[PDB]
Design a protein around this motif. Sequence first.
Motif, PDB file in Angstrom:
ATOM      1  N   UNK A 184      11.094   9.135  -7.855  1.00  0.00           N
ATOM      2  CA  UNK A 184       9.910   9.862  -7.421  1.00  0.00           C
ATOM      3  C   UNK A 184      10.294  10.984  -6.456  1.00  0.00           C
ATOM      4  N   UNK A 185       9.312  11.817  -6.135  1.00  0.00           N
ATOM      5  CA  UNK A 185       9.527  12.972  -5.273  1.00  0.00           C
ATOM      6  C   UNK A 185       9.685  12.513  -3.821  1.00  0.00           C
TER       7      UNK A 185
ATOM      8  N   UNK B 152       5.963  10.793   4.365  1.00  0.00           N
ATOM      9  CA  UNK B 152       5.423   9.889   5.367  1.00  0.00           C
ATOM     10  C   UNK B 152       6.282   9.895   6.630  1.00  0.00           C
TER      11      UNK B 152
ATOM     12  N   UNK C 286      -7.954  -2.116  -3.866  1.00  0.00           N
ATOM     13  CA  UNK C 286      -9.084  -2.887  -3.348  1.00  0.00           C
ATOM     14  C   UNK C 286      -9.220  -2.685  -1.835  1.00  0.00           C
ATOM     15  N   UNK C 287      -9.452  -1.430  -1.454  1.00  0.00           N
ATOM     16  CA  UNK C 287      -9.650  -1.050  -0.062  1.00  0.00           C
ATOM     17  C   UNK C 287     -10.582   0.154  -0.018  1.00  0.00           C
ATOM     18  N   UNK C 288     -10.702   0.756   1.162  1.00  0.00           N
ATOM     19  CA  UNK C 288     -11.508   1.956   1.357  1.00  0.00           C
ATOM     20  C   UNK C 288     -10.739   2.918   2.253  1.00  0.00           C
TER      21      UNK C 288
ATOM     22  N   UNK D 267      -7.935   4.453   1.940  1.00  0.00           N
ATOM     23  CA  UNK D 267      -6.502   4.193   2.030  1.00  0.00           C
ATOM     24  C   UNK D 267      -5.724   4.916   0.935  1.00  0.00           C
TER      25      UNK D 267
ATOM     26  N   UNK E 234      -3.688   8.291  -0.534  1.00  0.00           N
ATOM     27  CA  UNK E 234      -2.890   9.424  -0.089  1.00  0.00           C
ATOM     28  C   UNK E 234      -2.402  10.305  -1.230  1.00  0.00           C
TER      29      UNK E 234
ATOM     30  N   UNK F  44      -0.285  13.210 -11.015  1.00  0.00           N
ATOM     31  CA  UNK F  44       1.133  13.324 -11.344  1.00  0.00           C
ATOM     32  C   UNK F  44       2.001  12.603 -10.321  1.00  0.00           C
ATOM     33  N   UNK F  45       1.717  12.796  -9.031  1.00  0.00           N
ATOM     34  CA  UNK F  45       2.472  12.089  -8.012  1.00  0.00           C
ATOM     35  C   UNK F  45       2.287  10.588  -8.094  1.00  0.00           C
TER      36      UNK F  45
ATOM     37  N   UNK G 230       4.287   9.345 -11.169  1.00  0.00           N
ATOM     38  CA  UNK G 230       5.717   9.460 -10.916  1.00  0.00           C
ATOM     39  C   UNK G 230       6.176   8.597  -9.749  1.00  0.00           C
TER      40      UNK G 230
ATOM     41  N   UNK H 189       6.245   5.540  -9.610  1.00  0.00           N
ATOM     42  CA  UNK H 189       6.615   4.242 -10.154  1.00  0.00           C
ATOM     43  C   UNK H 189       8.026   4.325 -10.714  1.00  0.00           C
TER      44      UNK H 189
ATOM     45  N   UNK I 229     -12.273 -11.516  -4.205  1.00  0.00           N
ATOM     46  CA  UNK I 229     -12.763 -11.402  -5.569  1.00  0.00           C
ATOM     47  C   UNK I 229     -12.232 -12.533  -6.439  1.00  0.00           C
TER      48      UNK I 229
END
Lengths: 603, 437, 409, 140
Positions: A314-315, A319, B29-31, B33, B35, B40-41, B44, B46, C161
């Motif tokens: 990945x790029x 962070x 499963x959040x709110x 969170x 980024x 594409x990012x 990629x 993974x 869940x």
Amino acid sequence: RDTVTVYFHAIVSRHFGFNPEEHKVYVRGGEGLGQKGWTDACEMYCTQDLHDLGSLVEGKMDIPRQSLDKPIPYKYVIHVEYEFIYEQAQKKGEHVNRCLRVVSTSLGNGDWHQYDDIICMRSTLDSTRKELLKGKKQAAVVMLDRIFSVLQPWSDINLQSFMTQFLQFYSVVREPMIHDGRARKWTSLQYEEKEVWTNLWEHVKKQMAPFLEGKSGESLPADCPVRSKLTLGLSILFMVEAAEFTVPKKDLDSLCYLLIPSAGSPEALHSDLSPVLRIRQRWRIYLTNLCLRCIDERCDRWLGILPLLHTCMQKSPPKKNSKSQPEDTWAGLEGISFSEFRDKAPTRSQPLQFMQSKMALLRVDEYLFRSWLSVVPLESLSSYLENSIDYLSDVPVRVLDCLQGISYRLPGLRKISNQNMKKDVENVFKMLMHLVDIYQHRIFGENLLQIYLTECLTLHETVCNITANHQFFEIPALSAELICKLLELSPPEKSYEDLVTSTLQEALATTRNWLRSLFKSRMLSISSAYVRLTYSEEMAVWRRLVEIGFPEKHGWKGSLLGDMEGRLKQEPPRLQISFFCSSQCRDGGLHDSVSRSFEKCVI
Amino acid sequence: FLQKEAELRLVKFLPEILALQRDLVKQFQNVSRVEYSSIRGFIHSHSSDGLRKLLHDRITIFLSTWNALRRSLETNGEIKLPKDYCCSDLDLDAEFEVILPRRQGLGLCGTALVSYLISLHNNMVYTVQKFSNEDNSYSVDISEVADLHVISYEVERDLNPLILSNCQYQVQQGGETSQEFDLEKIQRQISSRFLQGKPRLTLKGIPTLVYRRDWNYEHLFMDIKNKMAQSSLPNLAISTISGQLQSYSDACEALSIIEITLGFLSTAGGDPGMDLNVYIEEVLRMCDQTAQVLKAFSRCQLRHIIALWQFLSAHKSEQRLRLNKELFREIDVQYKEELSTQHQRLLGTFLNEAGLDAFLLELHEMIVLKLKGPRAANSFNPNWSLKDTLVSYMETKDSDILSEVESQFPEEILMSSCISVWKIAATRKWDRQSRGG
Amino acid sequence: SQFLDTTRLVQSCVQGAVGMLRDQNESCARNMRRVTILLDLLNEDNTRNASFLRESKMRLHVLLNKQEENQVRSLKEWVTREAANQDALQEAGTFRHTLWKRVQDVVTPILASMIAHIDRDGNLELLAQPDSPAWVQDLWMFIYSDIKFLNISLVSFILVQSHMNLLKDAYNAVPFSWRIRDYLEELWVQAQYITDTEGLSKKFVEIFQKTPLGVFLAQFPVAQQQKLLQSYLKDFLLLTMKVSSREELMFLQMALWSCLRELQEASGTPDETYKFPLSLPWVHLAFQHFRTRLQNFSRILTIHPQVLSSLSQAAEKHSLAGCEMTLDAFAAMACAEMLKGDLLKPSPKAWLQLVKNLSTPLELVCSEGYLCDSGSMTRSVIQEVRALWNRIFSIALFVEHVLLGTESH
Amino acid sequence: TQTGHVLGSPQSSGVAEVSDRGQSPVVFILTRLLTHLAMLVGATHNPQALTVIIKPWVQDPQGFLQQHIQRDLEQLTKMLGRSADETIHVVHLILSSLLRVQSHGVLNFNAELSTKGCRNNWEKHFETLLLRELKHLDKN
């Protein structure tokens, strides 16, 4: 579907007097070939002339799938002259003949390649065995050359065909097998896999040699089967890995030279080469074991293997530090113990010269600079920052990665007692401020100031707790200078004011905690009627921590002065009067605030 | 069928986009969170090449079907959406949030797509049922839908031959070639393979993520009132409680304990009896903190809990009044305006004849539940009166004293100054309670 | 360390953590049950409980360590920061009470998120259920004793869940259902991407044994391994397909077991991948090769609820599911028999609706494309059910053509 | 609502522009084709007024409407099992047939299409005339 394609490759010796125009060759074997036993099953066609060795010949046929993992007797005949195997039959009247065992698991793409050595005519023991061994050596060399040539053009299908062909080649050659009643190893040859791969390595070295001399493209020998240096490097990687056999330490300087991405600076070439190496799982283990095998006390050209590994993930993660993971993942290594090489006697001066010789490699990706950050020795890190002036001028953003790297390596290093890394630290910090202020304030652009502020304050906090000797106060001093100069450079909403307030509060809190921490004692103890400070060079310490110019709306002039006045008031007035003009509280600093506070406390 | 065949052809890929939605829901499963800027990012990001190509083809199909169906969503779907979503041809390098099936902001792409697909499938099966079958009970949820349950066909490979076999040629003795489409055979051919035996889809197992933080406390009150026959606090009981919580930190500890117990009780059951003591000690098993609060709760059951909470809350706030402590520190300053002389005069005119004990309690509840600071003028702009909002809020669930606050309450209360009325009422009550004896 | 009683802190704050947890308003809300089971399992009397407490301690430690790294140290130095919060001081009695309140309010949301991430469906009940076989707690601890395998995030009323639409007290038999499901799914994805569909089973099983979970389960004996396997088929069947009964779940269990055995009989005699046939990946393999069949079986189980009655006699009068799978074939046979039994009893139109609802699944099951290869007995069964299906379809066409016309006109 | 000429680029793989709430597909297609050519005729004099009228584009009504008409014509030749020449013949017959409809029964509707009721009445009469003239092309 019920048939498997077997490609038979052989060499007819010059003693046969074989003529492709006049004589024909066939493969005759038992019923395991799918045809009638000992009949003409596969016509065997000549492809190349090997001069003294003879003629290289190739053919193909389809055998039933029921014959997989079973011994099939077969022999080569020339139209009829049967091939002669210089082996005595265990059973009288039985014929020593070649054995075909197609490995079902090793089919790969579905096609098996049976490599048969030079076909020897019966001469109408030790010397004959040696000559046959030489012929088999040359045969193995030329079929390895053919497997080399299969790799062109550079494609994924060609690479898979190459790996399957090499696996079958090694399986056939390492264990010469014959069939006389029952399949058995050809032990009378004494051609152990040790000698097999000795000959293979000696053949490989002659393909290694031309690239070491700088030959590439057209300048390469016309008989060289591999044209791209990276392709040859990947090929030798695959061959030595699939056999798991030792490499001479002299040959590392060659094999690690092959993998260098010469003439591949733009990322377009690497992205276009990625489809040839789509599998992102086996190549990782391959490259990690390669580097770990090269981690021996040569460790020279392996820095060139990082970009090749670093072009297929990945790029770059933007962070902040201490949030994701330690340097293993940020630099992208995750498999190299640089901690032992960064913290040891730096007897290897090669890596600095290597990096100086490969500025161009720094532009082929973005993981290379961060990876090099965590591997270079600290004492030479100032020179590493110096050498990247052009790279930082091209993109004034890599200073963020520099901050990430320093905030990564600094907390790991043990507490401070020496003078060498004092010079190291001051030099690296001065190069840092240099490379910070020279370019512009565009570093803080595109709303990137928040993470920069966080990195600076984390560096402050993580560098305060490595100094407890009151003489290295210069490290926090230039740290405060760094935060001060990065505070005043950003362009002028209220979010910047809130961020600067919070950052300066954290900075002064960290400094205050540090000053309380290393001063866990009294001060200006007399003990001789000749009062002197227990931290004799403390006053100048204060002197360097106050002149740093911060916004007066904040503290650092109402907070730190209060700290000093609390510090002094415990001491008895008589003792401080005696110390007051003891010829040590000199240097009236032209309305120096600390000297003025000394005056106020004394009055 | 020929009216909506164009969109029916794309319902075959509904399970694919649904599975994508399940994966994205489980993995996020959040709110707030997120980024990743572009898809594409995210793809990629993974290392698994197989999973990367899975996401690649799945998102390519999702993009294609979204682009193919982004015309009827603004006019035919039962969910209303702005036009900014379908005005542009989204690509792989587009924003990342769009693939997330939210329901309020920028997340209506996937939700609208799947809802339109299920709606058209349901409408088709409903029409077929009401045409011939007239009765059915087969139905499945969206939690286990498979490729076998959906309707799928290829026009060139399956739909064209079945209709081309139903073109009938007729010839007369005089010489002619007439074309006829016998409706019965083609109807039986098309119906018996694609649109018969299919389940009736329902919108229960929809992949949807929670966006709203259920902290308004009103659903908890409704659940308590619906699960149990809640009852008011007896006067001797509340008098004893106010007697035993005269301290402040005691009130804060009681507040914490009762908030935890109310959070448990709202999302669970509780017997109207089974007094608060045994509920506290052994129903949920926390350790003993201070005997005072337990001795206070001793004479209460579950059937009063919410009422107790409200009173307890008032007590805390009322305490902050006596010690001249800034009593909110959380609400908007727009409501912290002092009443005028005439305003307080009419307020005192109301207070002289009023059941202050319940009125101050309910008004404090209103402030502490709705007047939270920012985002408070939506339905409580500081320009209405109090009698209207009070009667509107109390006619829902309250049957207590009402006539005093609509026949004697000030008619110009100046909602802008809403804390002042309750503060002055609390001061009046405190003077009445303390100065007499 | 001894600087604060961590066990006391968690025992106090479990109520606060679980109080804000909520299910989907109908999925067996166990808040009182959750706190009771936690306090049952949050003591030091049992070595199992001590191990749980230690693992929770390290998990809370590492989670908070990753958590505070975004703070500016203005909250890392929490004591002075709290002290300056004077209203917090006057609300919390003394000073040490206020420090304890701050610690517990810091800890409660994290532990609540831990409960939500762990107690997705009732994983806690397995430990508290007595006479639990050793594999249960061993696997629960092993999955709970890792970082990368079970990574826990953080974030008001958080949500927990359900994953299988659990009935009353489902308490999934496996220690962890969803995590193992997704882990094996991604392992299958990687194995099938890297290698073609020729050694797919071999590559999948070898990459299963390569993971630490495989080497862990290899230490389990045969009895516990096979019980874990059966529980694994049960949980996978419940998760993937939702059934409104209990006997049909066992019928699907036996169908999947027969499919797994049949898959393990496809190869002649490899003796390299069949040396560990009682292994988890085969389950997924079975589905990936028979999903359509299973799906169709599911349909023939969902379309008719009374057919199970005939299935109730199947193993009693057939001893089926020995080597291959035949349950879909027997379901088709039973449906055909119930068709041919009465033909007029409920109502001719109700019959017509019944037969037309099950017309297309019975057409799908009687297809050569459906049955790519199986035993000759199964082929004969599909041929005879083809004959009976054609007969009943002709009867349905006849009745729909004459009786409707003679009853409406 | 959403008045104007809100339409995407005709080179889209979306829906085939199925008929609206209450129109037969052939009549709806003919009506939209006639409206498009009317907008072309109006734009050939003052393209700025149409630029104000149509929301999305700002460059050129002519090219976009040309692509619209090309898509319309190819879908028409995919609509009738005729030749493209025969589709042109059919559209010419339809166009010339509404010239000889002097019979006046088109009352109680506004001549400006400023209201949805009058727009729907206009669509109703347009559907009536279009069906009356398309039930007369097979034998002509």
